[PDB]
């Protein structure tokens, strides 16, 4: 059978297949062990087995193909690639490899690759002639990712406000500064739904770090793209691993001239994970943050760019403030001036039970004239002039009232014009 | 005539064969048998080649043209048609 | 008869029982020795003897059926189970096994499990086909646990205000933040009494870590459900060992579509116990707590969830703040954004002898609209709007005054409005 | 008809004998003697079975049908059907 759909079937359905096949006592072990067991039994019949995954090269030299269903968690069912294969095909970590697999031999504990017939959704000899991501020249974003769905629903109101405040383009590097309770999660979900509907071609990845287990489940059911998360009960090295896999996988897709969007929640929790893992260097900043700890989170955030050739990489990360931790404040200080887009959520607007709780005055984008047209930019400047005197709570209440009556931002500008 | 790459396990068998310099016996599609040692694995123009020191001249042959190979240390290996 | 009945049998009663059946000597006061002898005579006569306990598999391969009365402490009377039986029936740590019990063989210190007929309160064949806890998909808590009793007594005020401040649902990962002196133990007792009376079906477990023996004695009397505790004089390894027994026992019950509620006192003490038992990871952060030390407690705390298939596990843990030591506060900072419900206790309200000293403005859950009905949530929002400008100390006085003359919160809402 | 699991101690004795290749003497309900070699214990369809390679036949039979088992090296006891 194909390994990819086995990892998608429910655990209860796997038990029925395993018992039917001939296995027993597989109802009291983890899903990875169940999948490995049924694959082992099927391999004894001599039938070919197809598997796929994302390559992760270890420091020793060999690598494993890990699946996004388990959030790239190491397990018995992971496929093993020999160092020669990584040298035969010019394979880097993050490459998506598909092909046939074989059962482990004596002294082997993992399934091994048998025949590679697809690398990064392309022929193996064509994927090895792609220029590396580091060699691509960054550019300012010039293609607009319009969040406005235009159906006039209440959940579409957040998308319309987002277009007015901070336009988002392909290759943007945005930050969402949020207090502890400002509807941050629903803001990300609204963005993900807008991306899936308006731009089905763009590859969407949602990355969650130190997330509660129940929050992960609802995100996977809602987001149309791919959701990879690490719960807070997992070790700090696990948070780093999943983040490295996502960014490397995104880079490989961009090398094939694809638009990749990464929604990160949160850059603060990612930085704290790196602080734990990175060895101390003796230069500890305020709040107990190592100086070299933040070098790697910035590399993750700094990869967002608009490639001059085909492709783009958009990263929209959330930064946590007012959490009562000195470490969180220090982390946000270093990431303050690094983003093209800034979107500020206001606690007080949320306390008034008004959503989206967006601080319009403090949120904007750099070089926004490239994303929008000429006439639309003039209308946006008119709106910002009106909003500027108003207070943060008053502005959002006023803004939603004028948007509720209209159905599209074009109509909203026309009504506001007269 | 396109080139059909060999399976990963078969390639690994030749890969460590070059490292240990085995005097493996090579059998081709036409039935030509030779006893030589593979120096290394070289791939050019997206086509993989095997270089062996038969007759002391370092002949080069395609991977897919090899039918079988064996050594006294590692049993007979038959490459799949796929 | 069974071993369990002889455990709690009064010393005078068992002497009367022993003399009539034909026990030769009963002058000795050692309870374990005499109950050992009567079982041996029963075995010689062929009389069947039964026993029960909670399995605890050790790293060697075999385990013992510990008893909840002794707080799962290792003892001579613990029933030994061979590793062959562990392989025969799929047994994990925490399973409760009841069945025939064999007297110890010559050279064996402990009794051996003669036969097992009921595991986890179900037939052995059916209990081996239960999906593992890790394979269950978490969900947000939807069905709530009402604790507003209709008695109307003075103790019911603490339950009623807790219902208004922060609802509790099935699978809620609640957290209690308390200063050193805020009447914390009273709050746990009120919840435990409320849970037992309102929800008899839900299994209730109370876990106490580093607790004085006098507190354990009264807690067991008050709480109807099982109470397990470890005294402070015991080594730190005991606190870790008892914690594993409680959580693993809960997980096995949840696999049987059971709702399990765990009250923890406290997560701060449990974190300290794990800190001193784990090997040093080479990197130590502020407060002298190892980075990998906190991984294990998060596994305990993060297990609380609402299983989609059926059943739930509710963990409500207490945390201590501003207790002098900075180790306590860094532990709380690590567990801050990890719980669904957050209930705060204020010292300045406790000093004024106003109980319960909860901070209404700084406590609450995350998704109240799932636990409460549509109408109740609006009333809570209206009440929250009134309380919000008020200070923490005066708000409680406002709450207790208006909750004194109201029998039920529904009547309180009618009184509150207009 | 319905299979009844044997006692744990009876299960252990066969388990320890089969795990270190100990010859076992079979006594069934009918009363026939089957002195042969037992390999291990296999459980299928929630029913425990014992496989005995009597002259290579590798016969498989239910555990509850065994009346008793005897051996000089280990303790000789009779299972209880209750
Ligand atoms: N657009 C919205 N419409 C209605 N309610 C909202 C909206 N955004 C946020 N909320 C409310 O604010 C709360 C914020 O929860 P959530 O966003 O899940 O966590 P966080 O704010 O930490 O990201 C939710 O309980 C939700 O009821």
Swiss-Prot record, chains A, C:
Gene3D superfamilies tied to this protein: 1.10.720.10, Nucleic acid-binding proteins (2.40.50.140), P-loop containing nucleotide triphosphate hydrolases (3.40.50.300)
Gene Ontology molecular function: ATP binding; ATP hydrolysis activity; ATP-dependent activity, acting on RNA; helicase activity; identical protein binding; RNA binding
Pfam families for this protein: ATP-synt_ab, Rho_N, Rho_RNA_bind
Annotated segments matching region RNA-binding 2: 284-288
E.C. no: 3.6.4.-
Residues holding ATP: 169-174, 181-186, 212
Listed InterPro entries: AAA+_ATPase, ATPase_F1/V1/A1_a/bsu_nucl-bd, CSD, NA-bd_OB-fold, P-loop_NTPase, Rho-like_N, Rho_factor_ATP-bd, Rho_N_sf
Sites annotated RNA-binding 2: 326
Impact when changing residue 184 to Q: Improves ATPase and helicase activity but reduced termination activity
Domain Rho RNA-BD: 48-123
Free-text note on domains in this protein's UniProt record: Each subunit has two RNA-binding sites, one at the surface of the hexameric ring, and one at the center of the open ring structure, where RNA helicase activity is thought to take place.
UniProt cross-references to NCBIfam families, sorted A to Z: PRK09376.1 (NF006886), rho (TIGR00767)
Subunit structure: Homohexamer. The homohexamer assembles into an open ring structure.
Name under which the protein is recorded: Transcription termination factor Rho
Organism of this sequence: Escherichia coli (strain K12)
Gene that this sequence comes from: rho
Curated annotation (Swiss-Prot), chains B, D:
Signal peptide boundaries: none
Classification via Pfam families: ROF (PF07073)
Origin superkingdom: Bacteria
GO biological process: one example: regulation of termination of DNA-templated transcription
SUPFAM superfamilies noted in UniProt: Rof/RNase P subunit-like
InterPro entries xref list: ROF, Rof-like_sf, Rof/RNase_P-like
Function: Suppresses temperature-sensitive mutations in essential genes by modulating rho-dependent transcription termination.
Protein name: Protein rof
């Amino acid at each position: 059978m194909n390994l990819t759909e086995l990892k998608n079937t429910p655990v209860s359905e796997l038990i029925t297949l395993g018992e039917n096949m001939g296995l027993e006592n597989l109802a009291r072990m983890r899903k990875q062990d169940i999948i490995f067991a049924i694959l082992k039994q099927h391999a004894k019949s001599g039938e070919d087995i197809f598997g796929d995954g994302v390559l992760e090269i270890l420091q020793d030299g060999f690598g494993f193909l890990r699946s996004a269903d388990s959030s790239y968690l190491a397990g018995p069912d992971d496929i093993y690639v020999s160092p020669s294969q990584i040298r035969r095909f010019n394979l880097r970590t993050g490459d998506t490899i598909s092909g046939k697999i074989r059962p482990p031999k004596e002294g082997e504990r993992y399934f091994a690759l048998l025949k590679v017939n697809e690398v990064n959704f392309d022929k193996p000899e064509n994927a090895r002639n792609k220029i590396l991501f580091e060699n691509l020249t960054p550019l300012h974003a010039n293609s607009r990712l319009r969040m406005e769905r235009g159906n006039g629903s209440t959940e579409d109101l957040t998308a319309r406000v987002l277009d007015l405040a901070s336009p988002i383009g392909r290759g943007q590097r945005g930050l969402i500064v949020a207090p502890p309770k400002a509807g941050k999660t629903m803001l990300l979900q609204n963005i993900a739904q807008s991306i899936a509907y308006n731009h089905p071609d763009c590859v969407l990845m949602v990355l969650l770090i130190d997330e509660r287990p129940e929050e992960v489940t609802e995100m996977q059911r809602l987001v149309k793209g791919e959701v990879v998360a690490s719960t807070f009960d997992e070790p700090a090295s696990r948070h780093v691993q999943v983040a490295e896999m996502v960014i490397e996988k995104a880079k490989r897709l961009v090398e094939h001239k694809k638009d990749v969007i990464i929604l990160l929640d949160s850059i603060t929790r990612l930085a704290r994970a790196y602080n734990t893992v990175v060895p101390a260097s003796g230069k500890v900043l305020t709040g107990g943050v190592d100086a070299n700890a933040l070098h790697r989170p910035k590399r993750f955030f700094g990869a967002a760019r608009n490639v001059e050739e085909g492709g783009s990489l958009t990263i929209i990360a959330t930064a946590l403030i007012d959490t009562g931790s000195k470490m969180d404040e220090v982390i946000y200080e270093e990431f303050k001036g690094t983003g093209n887009m800034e979107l500020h959520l206001s606690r007080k607007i949320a306390e008034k039970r008004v959503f989206p709780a967006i601080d319009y005055n403090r949120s904007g984008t750099r070089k926004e004239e490239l994303l929008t047209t000429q006439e639309e930019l003039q209308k946006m400047w008119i709106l910002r002039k009106i909003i500027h005197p108003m207070g943060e709570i008053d502005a959002m209440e006023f803004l939603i009232n004028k948007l509720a009556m209209t159905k599209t931002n074009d109509d909203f500008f026309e009504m506001m014009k007269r | 005539d396109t080139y059909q790459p060999i399976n990963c396990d078969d390639y690994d068998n030749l890969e460590l064969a070059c490292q240990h310099h085995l005097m493996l016996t090579l059998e081709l599609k036409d039935g030509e048998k030779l006893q030589a040692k593979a120096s290394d694995l070289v791939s050019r123009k997206n086509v993989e080649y095997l270089v062996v020191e038969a007759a002391g001249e370092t002949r080069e042959l395609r991977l897919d043209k090899i039918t079988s190979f064996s050594h006294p240390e590692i049993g007979t290996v038959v490459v799949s048609e796929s």
